Design a protein around this ligand. Sequence first.
Ligand SMILES: Nc1ncnc2c1ncn2[C@@H]1O[C@H](CO)[C@@H](O)[C@H]1O
Ligand SMILES: Nc1ncnc2c1ncn2[C@@H]1O[C@H](CO)[C@@H](O)[C@H]1O
Lengths: 241, 241
Amino acid sequence: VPRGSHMWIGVISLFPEMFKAITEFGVTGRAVKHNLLKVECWNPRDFTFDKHKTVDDRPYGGGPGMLMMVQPLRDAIHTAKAAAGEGAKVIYLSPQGRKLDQGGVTELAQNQKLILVCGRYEGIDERLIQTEIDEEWSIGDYVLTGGELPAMTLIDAVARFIPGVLADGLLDCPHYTRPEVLEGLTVPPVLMSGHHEEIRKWRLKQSLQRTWLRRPELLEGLALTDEQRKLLKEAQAEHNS
Amino acid sequence: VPRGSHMWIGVISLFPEMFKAITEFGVTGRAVKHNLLKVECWNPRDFTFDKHKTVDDRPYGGGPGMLMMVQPLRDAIHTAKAAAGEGAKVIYLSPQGRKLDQGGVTELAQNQKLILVCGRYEGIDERLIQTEIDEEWSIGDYVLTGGELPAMTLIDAVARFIPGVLADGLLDCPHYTRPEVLEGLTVPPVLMSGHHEEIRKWRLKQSLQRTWLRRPELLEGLALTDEQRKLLKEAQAEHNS
Ligand SMILES: Nc1ncnc2c1ncn2[C@@H]1O[C@H](CO)[C@@H](O)[C@H]1O
Ligand SMILES: Nc1ncnc2c1ncn2[C@@H]1O[C@H](CO)[C@@H](O)[C@H]1O
């Protein structure tokens, strides 16, 4: 199985078993079994030395909640970097990071090795971010209970760009399958015509219309081709009239 | 255990076992064990009648990829709705949906029952979205291999708003814990002062500064209090000088 552009992802997490969600199911799972993608985990808890294996600590300045204990976390990260070798970008998932989007995903997919730091509690010591982290990334403007889901969201997204694992700046067009009529709703005839060029145009027009109606801001960031400007103008006219 | 505002989430997915990621670990896992949150899954595969339990189908109009087979998917959804009863908002996760953000999460947390439809392959028939789905939500402007992660991201986010499970429009302030000095980096003295009012102000100022430097757009959507306008002006002056 062509492993040309395989990708290696190191993960620091208090709950390594969560990653089975992507390593044991669907396309990512097959990607892993086929060695196109490799996810390796290290758990801070294994780096503790106290009897109760404490992985959290109190924050200076008081306040609700806890933080990840520095020592065990720091040791796990160092161990991960040693295993990844040179040329491994370390990422910390958090809401204060760069907001992930398609463009950001493709950039991340350029890396052959990545180490993802998943925090729990209120996060991690600001100083570790300065001394151990290369970049902070957020999957969205919302707060989660841990960095695992965000980490898995990032892995899943980049995995699609790995050759062998498997829009145009616009939203997807509507998709249809059997049956021809579903609760009175029929499949658009053009899709049944077999006319590939018309089908291409119809789908592109739908994407433009749909993007225009639901996410107009996305259109400003685009430099439309003459064909796209025409199809868009058409959809808007049909929508107005 | 006060189950006052418990929440019920129905899930339609070809990979129910993925949800263990949130039902068996951390705060969401404890929330589930304590009955504050209940996640119930239905798998389309169980609703197939052919020998090979086929859950995908070809899209009309040709094109790469497949779609979820309508019949098994439709049947699972109907079964889920019957179990949820009246007053259950059905959500389909997809990039064409409303982009999730803190505000959207709080709105979703108002619901006592939710049914999340997770697609695989290229998604689901456009017509099912019109006849079975109430709202489409996206966790971000990036494409994933399935709706499970997005579904779990949504559940995790709303779960935090359920009383008993556990920012200000601004990014979080930096957090610190032991030790006082880490690789030459010392904890900001104010945090060690014990002066709660100064600590409050210092954190608020950091959030304003941090939000201003990393995500200035987030500030335009805010109507700052006099205190916040003062602290922000201060941070910008200190940053300039
Ligand atoms: N939207 C998000 N994107 C990335 N990481 C997040 C997000 N929300 C919370 N986290 C991380 O989960 C942990 C607990 O909040 C912290 O490490 C925090 O940075
Ligand atoms: N960013 C996203 N948010 C929500 N659902 C998504 C996202 N990306 C892909 N999906 C869903 O995963 C499945 C395969 O793309 C489809 O149901 C699709 O809508």
